[PDB]
Amino acid sequence: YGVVRYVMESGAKGCEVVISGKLRAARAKSMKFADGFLIHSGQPVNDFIETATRHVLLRQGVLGIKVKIMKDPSRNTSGPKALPDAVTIIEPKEEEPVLEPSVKDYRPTE
Amino acid sequence: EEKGWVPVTKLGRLVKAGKISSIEEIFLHSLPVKEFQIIDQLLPNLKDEVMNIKPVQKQTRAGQRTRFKAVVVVGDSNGHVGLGIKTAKEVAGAIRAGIIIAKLSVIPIRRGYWGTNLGQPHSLATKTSGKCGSVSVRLIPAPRGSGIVASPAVKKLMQLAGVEDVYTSSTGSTRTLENTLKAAFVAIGNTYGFLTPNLWEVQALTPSPMDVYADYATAS
Amino acid sequence: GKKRKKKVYTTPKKIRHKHKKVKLAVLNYYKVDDEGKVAKLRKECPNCGPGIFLANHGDRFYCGKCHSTFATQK
Amino acid sequence: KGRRGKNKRELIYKEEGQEYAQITKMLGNGRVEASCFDGNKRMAHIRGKLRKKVWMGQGDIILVSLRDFQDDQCDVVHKYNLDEARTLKNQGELPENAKINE
């Protein structure tokens, strides 16, 4: 939870840490500790989500740790700047339409 | 702690602006409470203790889904009690959510006199009862310095209430701890819920402090 | 997924070929001429160089500094 | 149902209070009765580690341990699956008055 809190503090929009092995017991276990949200399928999985796996040597054996971090698309250099389905509509600038007749003249220019 | 908190829930706006000195008017005017820091701000002296966490188990096609139901009790030891019941996946999350629930459900008590009053009433005003499931709980006024003659769970709840002497009489399947605590809680909440004589006279029907301060709520 | 039988041996023993701790081979090698000249014994190695004594087995004097080089009849 | 389970051995000889016996019939409740090769019909109990792990049936030479206080009963330990039974007959540790072949 310290790790995931640090990841959120760092500004990424989603973290997950998975620990499997002999968690304090003999029968195998695998607990997941996630926050934010993570995308699993679709090529953006490689585009943003960094992943690492490590083996930890404890007295009883080996614990597998998997870390997944979903980098913010906004600050992703060298790749798409947003998710595939992220639609950004743009606010149209407003104008007053009362100027109906409004004859105008410029000076002639060469 | 970074307690930023944009005000929600106009009551919250009033307390944040400090227009609510403490909970008595709230409880007086039966205000709705939906958020906990209202209790935190008004009562800065809530002590808490997780009575029991139970592994609650559901059966699905792929193994079994396990959650944890915490039954936590919060109080001031000076006449305010709340009880939170909450299930969640992780134990710590369950405990925190239960804490929030308990602070949401703070209820007052009527510390009465066993007879021939002195300073600082110790016992309960009147015998009360509460039913949850098969758990029927009786609270009886007790002579000063008789202690809290009660089962450990409700005894701790009484201690959190601030009461010093009460007699208890349970019936049913009190083994079920959440039912017992919930019954004792509704009973102790019933302590006001009993028109005693000395409380006869018509009151003045004070204007709702939450009403007359409407202009400080609903942030413009 | 298998339990192994004990390696029973139908072979008596083979022990390390212990080197022989020779007591003062140099007196065997040399011969002193009464507080003066000293002679060597049984040959000197020409293939290895002066000072390396050779081996006496029979009908052949043998090397052993460069062992395979010199084993010749004399 | 092998996924629920724990998932060329050698014979073991009797040792000072145990005997090879031939089951004569299989009794209920998990019991059994076997002739020990002494001229006696003893009552064997199917021991733990054995109950529903490895089976046995009639006409099977099988090791059984006696209980020192009550000789009339005994508890079966180790089974022999029809090929080292011939070896048991060969080595002559037990009398060959009982041959079992199909």
Add this chain to the structure above:
RNA sequence: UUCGGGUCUUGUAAUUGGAAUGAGUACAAUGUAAAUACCUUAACGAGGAACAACUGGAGGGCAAGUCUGGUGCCAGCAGCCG
């Protein structure tokens, strides 16, 4: 500026002293019909104060071990769950 005075206290040490005293002996006296014993009291009577506290238990119920070694659904434990 790291300090570190332990400056004030608490504990922990097979380190180390001198105090105090009974259980036991026992002069006596008292106590009793006679006596024991007590209540007093000479002189004796503590260093590891060997002048030695056991009885159950440490998964839950229920306070206390996921320490070591042994046995390996056997021996056994367990009022019940195990």
Add this chain to the structure above:
RNA sequence: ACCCACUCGGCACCUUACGAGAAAUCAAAGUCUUUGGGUUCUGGGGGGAGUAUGGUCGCAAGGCUGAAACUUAAAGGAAUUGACGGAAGGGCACCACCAGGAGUGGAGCCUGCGGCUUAAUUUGACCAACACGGGGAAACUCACCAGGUCCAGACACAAUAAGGAUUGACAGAUUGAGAGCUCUUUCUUGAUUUUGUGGGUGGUGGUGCAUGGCCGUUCUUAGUUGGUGGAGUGAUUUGUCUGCUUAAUUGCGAUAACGAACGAGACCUUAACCUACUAAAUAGGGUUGCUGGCACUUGCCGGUUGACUCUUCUUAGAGGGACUAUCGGUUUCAAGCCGAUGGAAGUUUGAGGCAAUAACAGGUCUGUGAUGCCCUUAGACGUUCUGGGCCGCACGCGCGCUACACUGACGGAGCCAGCGAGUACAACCUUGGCCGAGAGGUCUGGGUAAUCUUGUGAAACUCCGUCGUGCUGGGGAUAGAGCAUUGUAAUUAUUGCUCUUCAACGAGGAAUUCCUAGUAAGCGCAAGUCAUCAGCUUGCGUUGAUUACGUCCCUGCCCUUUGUACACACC
């Protein structure tokens, strides 16, 4: 007789909880811890058991009365979620069926299992094991077996010990050995050692039911989850739904639900379309030279690192292009579904890659210097060397191969591809010219790669002939001999080629597999393995269809409803 407003009494009913209950529910099962209207009769855990016995009524059947000894930690009630149902409903799937196509199962061969045998036939998987562990093992790979070596036993301490800890050793005996393995002797070597104690390494030793990682499967379907919010005392539930719609929990919507997250899609690779752009002797084309042949009219077909020019074809970047477009039907007219036109493409455009929560005692310690524990650690389970086996054979089973011939076999002749790959610290792809019948060898070449192999001039196929219904020129196993090739080593036949032998086989029982368009099927080719080896496998292209374009009947799957004594869940 009806209508209205009644009222008294009766069977009942609906709504609700503001009362109860543990709930299902109850207008009484309320007026019960705030415990008292009057009253009878029953029960005190379940079994034993309404049984024993004695009465008592009865003809009899039997009824009423009615235990105990003893045996157990439960039995039981209501509801919740799953599972299950030869329960219901609505939808799906060629790992289901229908219409069929191709077959497999019969035959011989190959290959992998089991069994048997063996010294060893090393081993692990039993829909999701079986042409799988890339497992196409001659030495190695190595795991087993008969054997021989060596220590790749760090470091600490002690102990010997420099008058030598020790090592190495020609020749012989001995050894398969040209091993100083052991011995005979003698030499050589010098503090790195040796032998005892710890201690550590090593291990294709064991334990996938200690484990990580890994992938497989549940599960190619569409399903998951939390936050406040409501319902419940709670197990939980609603959101996640009545309907219609989609391939989709996909939407239209309806809604104690609201807004959110994953999965699906979206997205990426590939396949297609770009006379639009950018360009090109490592791709092509035109003109034009110089040349070859023919017709002779200036026409063709050719060659040619000549010159100029071009980019349609070939490349690959930028991009463009389709989103159901347009229209006609149908649709609470919305979601969409159908039909035609335009088009290149109108099934999600085709095929794919990633692919949720939860889980399996699924497999893997035999991939790992991933790894806990245990085992062994000197005549070793370390490592190496020689040889054997993993490929044996009374038998059964699974992938596949060649066939059973006339749509054929054998001769000629025609002559079209697409994915690849390729020599370095070594030695590949090999053109061409030689020779040989052939496999082959030979000498020079090119090619580190759109350049050369290469236009891989491949097969089926196409055309002309021979054969002629014959187990026949079908079929080519099983069998002798020879020539070569890789290899230190081909015997237990590596492989190729040559001759001869020609077996079994007549469309294959019950069953069962796969499949809806460039599809199945036939046909090969390239790559992995590789020194040599494929019948395997990935990919590629070629010749290219019959039959659906639907349904839950078998086998399953989604969700909903329902019932359950199930929860290790109908095994």
Add this chain to the structure above:
RNA sequence: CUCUAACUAUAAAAAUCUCUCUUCUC
């Protein structure tokens, strides 16, 4: 602010099931 009309039509057979049940504390 006026109303009460449609409807069909199935059942053959299918018995049994050996283990192994294992924590939630911040």
